């Protein structure tokens, strides 16, 4: 499968290319990235080497939250309308 979805995935990619201070997230490589609504929220599970670099990737996505958000911005243009959200594993996938 792919559809627009894959398109969105390739979108963020197009950014990382030349973007994202110090190539990092470029290693991530999502394998799920749930699309919330359409382009409102993007729960990128991220799947770098083996989570051994996530700290770097996820940490990058934090500051890269700008370029990323800009991606969806290329289309829409509103706070509560588009934006990417970093995810690792449902936050925790448990309680504590």
Swiss-Prot record:
GO cellular component, one term: cytosol
Statement: the UniProt record of this protein carries the keyword Cytoplasm: yes
GO biological process, one term: maturation of SSU-rRNA
Localization per record: Cytoplasm
Keywords, comma-separated and alphabetical: Cytoplasm, Ribosome biogenesis
MF term (GO), any: ribosomal small subunit binding
Family classification: Belongs to the RbfA family.
Biological function: One of several proteins that assist in the late maturation steps of the functional core of the 30S ribosomal subunit. Associates with free 30S ribosomal subunits (but not with 30S subunits that are part of 70S ribosomes or polysomes). Required for efficient processing of 16S rRNA. May interact with the 5'-terminal helix region of 16S rRNA.
Quaternary data: Monomer. Binds 30S ribosomal subunits, but not 50S ribosomal subunits or 70S ribosomes.
Protein name as annotated: Ribosome-binding factor A
Source organism of this protein record: Mycoplasma pneumoniae (strain ATCC 29342 / M129 / Subtype 1) (Mycoplasmoides pneumoniae)
